Amino acid sequence: GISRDSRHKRAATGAKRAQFRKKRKFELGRQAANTKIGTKRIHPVRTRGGNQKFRALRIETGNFSWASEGVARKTRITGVVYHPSNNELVRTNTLTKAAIVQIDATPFRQWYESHYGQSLGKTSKNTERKWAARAAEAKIEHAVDSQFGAGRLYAAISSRPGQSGRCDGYILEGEELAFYLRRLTAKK
Amino acid sequence: ARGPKKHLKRLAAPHHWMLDKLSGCYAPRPSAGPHKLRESLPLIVFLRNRLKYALNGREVKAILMQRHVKVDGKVRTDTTFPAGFMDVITLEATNENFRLVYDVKGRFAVHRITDEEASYKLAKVKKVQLGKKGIPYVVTHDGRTIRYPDPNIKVNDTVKVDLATGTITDFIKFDTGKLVYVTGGRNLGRVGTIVHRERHEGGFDLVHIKDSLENTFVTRLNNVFVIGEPGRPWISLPKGKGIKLTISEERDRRRAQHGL
Amino acid sequence: MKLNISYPINGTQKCIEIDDEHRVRVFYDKRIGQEVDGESVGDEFKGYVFKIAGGND
RNA sequence: UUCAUAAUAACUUUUCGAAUCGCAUGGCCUUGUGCUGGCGAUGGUUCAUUCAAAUUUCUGCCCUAUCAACUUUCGAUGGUAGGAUAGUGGCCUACCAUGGUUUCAACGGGUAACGGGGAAUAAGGGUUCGAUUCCGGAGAGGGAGCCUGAGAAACGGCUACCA
RNA sequence: GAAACUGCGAAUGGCUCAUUAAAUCAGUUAUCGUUUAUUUGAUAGUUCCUUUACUACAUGGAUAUCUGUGGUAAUUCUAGAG
Ligand SMILES: [Mg+2]
Ligand SMILES: [Mg+2]
Ligand SMILES: [Mg+2]
Ligand SMILES: [Mg+2]
Ligand SMILES: [Mg+2]
Ligand SMILES: [Mg+2]
Ligand SMILES: [Mg+2]
Ligand SMILES: [Mg+2]
Ligand SMILES: [Mg+2]
Ligand SMILES: [Mg+2]
Ligand SMILES: [Mg+2]
Ligand SMILES: [Mg+2]
Ligand SMILES: [Mg+2]
Ligand SMILES: [Mg+2]
């Protein structure tokens, strides 16, 4: 149906290319998934070469990830917080690649309580040396700390949730993190 | 149309079958396998047109079902298996083993090989790459992939293959002054030495290859298959031995040799 | 009209042609997947319990 | 090369890792019917290869200025991002820029045009023809839409509307 | 071994030339830009989740062909139970 033909597109100059052949399967491109965050659902699809290519549908949760530490968790999503293609996907709350989003952050705390155990927002004798050997490694970039206290970090998902099925993404850190915050204050 | 093609029409039949213009609308499509459509040789052509052990396709089919036929160790019951270049076809009834090697003309030849040497198959590369479990592996243009090769088996360099077991006996490096058999159209089935390797960025590696007679010629690397170092090629080659004579030279040898 | 009665366990089943209209009027306005009584269907059937499943226009 | 490949982090409506099958009945006694083992079949993972597949590079078409402008509201040209796709992409969407082609014939029209291999003619140069045994491409009354499937926008499949 | 499900095939061949004039097509590259059943080559001790009494020498109920019960003016239409 929704084909990807170079057949259509008039032409490089203008010459309205005549409809050579009825459009083919191998040219096709299916309906856009635009997956929400409202009760976890996935349908697969039989693509080229068989291939189960899972289409995410109202996907809740995805494993959003640190940089400094290098970790990700069974992390709940909250909402579509800013999408730099089209703002249409912000209000409808449709999740998409490179969309800025908010992360429940409780799993990012619970695991951080082990990793270092210094706590973010504001027992046993030999562990105290592993606790002491670790920690004071990463100080974290302020916005992430306040967002840790908010229970709502700023990720920027990088899976393709109509292709993949998985809604797995990436916690914003540093410059890009500093940038998308300015756009969030511009939009709000 | 609508996916891959199942027939192969006889005029389209690659010429080095030497398939007959008449006596069939179709040709046997060489099935999928280790060798490319036109570079292969399906067994029907081999057993019928070439050797004449069968008088028709029926008899070839049965010949494969009873089953003394063994292309590269394994048996085959496939009338149109791609028995390509280097493929050791052993018929245990008659003991008439054949390696598949190009006559100087270009068209493949019956070489009635030993017990004996027909036991390894020389094979090229292709890749060098690595796979999962970090295993380094080598691939032969002439079909197979062989695991765990010697690190300095490089690309466009031959490899002797144990064939029955399927491992590595030995390898010949590719470089200057090394006997090289040829598998490219016009220079196809000639033999020579190697002088240059024009490197060329993107547009195909060339190789300047003087024969015994020292008539120079050029090919591409992909159409070249290193049979050894000069003097000792690792395969027993047919009468002619990769020389490729002139037209008058062939006319001379024919009308000189008249022994009734 | 005809009926298509079938006993499960024994595996014995029969044609019952019914010309009398009152006998057939019990089944009217029911749906495939329900229980029926033996007495209202006829005089030959009494005490039985049918199960309406299946049919044809 | 952001490659092959290897690591640290996890997830996941946690894929795959044989509750499968035909011939053969061997080897040790801890003398149980014990533990053991041959020749095959299919299946199944990504890597290979083959058959291919989609794109795509360059260059190349018949007549017409009694077609000199055309494309850009309704993607035209480019960009950023996504969306989709097996995948590249104005293939689609948002926001932005104003490009793009043109007398070295754009655009338009015509074609009693499917393209090529070739054919006839036959000094050389050529002309005209190529529906037609091979190779591509299309189509299965039209135009759509899709199921299954590795591969179909199938039509000796289906859904519809027109005829 | 009829029948049937599963498998695979029916996207091949065949016909035709309506479209179609940078489109197709020819050679030429490219896919470091992709899918590829089949093909013949390759190959998975880690499923366990505290480790003093647990399905593994084998887990479950269905559905077809069948047994009949039928319809129809028609049809390679098939509804119910076992
Ligand atoms: Mg066809
Ligand atoms: Mg290259
Ligand atoms: Mg990589
Ligand atoms: Mg695969
Ligand atoms: Mg993109
Ligand atoms: Mg026409
Ligand atoms: Mg023409
Ligand atoms: Mg033609
Ligand atoms: Mg015509
Ligand atoms: Mg054709
Ligand atoms: Mg007609
Ligand atoms: Mg159709
Ligand atoms: Mg057809
Ligand atoms: Mg038809």
Curated annotation (Swiss-Prot), chain C:
Has the keyword Phosphoprotein been applied to this entry?
yes
Domain of life of the native organism: Eukaryota
Q: Name one GO cellular component term.
A: ribosome
Family membership = Belongs to the eukaryotic ribosomal protein eS6 family.
List, in alphabetical order, the GO biological process terms annotated in this UniProt record.
Answer: translation
Per the UniProt record, the source organism is Kluyveromyces lactis (strain ATCC 8585 / CBS 2359 / DSM 70799 / NBRC 1267 / NRRL Y-1140 / WM37) (Yeast)
Single GO MF descriptor: structural constituent of ribosome
PTM statement from Swiss-Prot or TrEMBL: Phosphorylated.
Q: What is this protein called?
A: Small ribosomal subunit protein eS6
Q: Which keywords does this chain's UniProt record carry?
A: Phosphoprotein, Ribonucleoprotein, Ribosomal protein
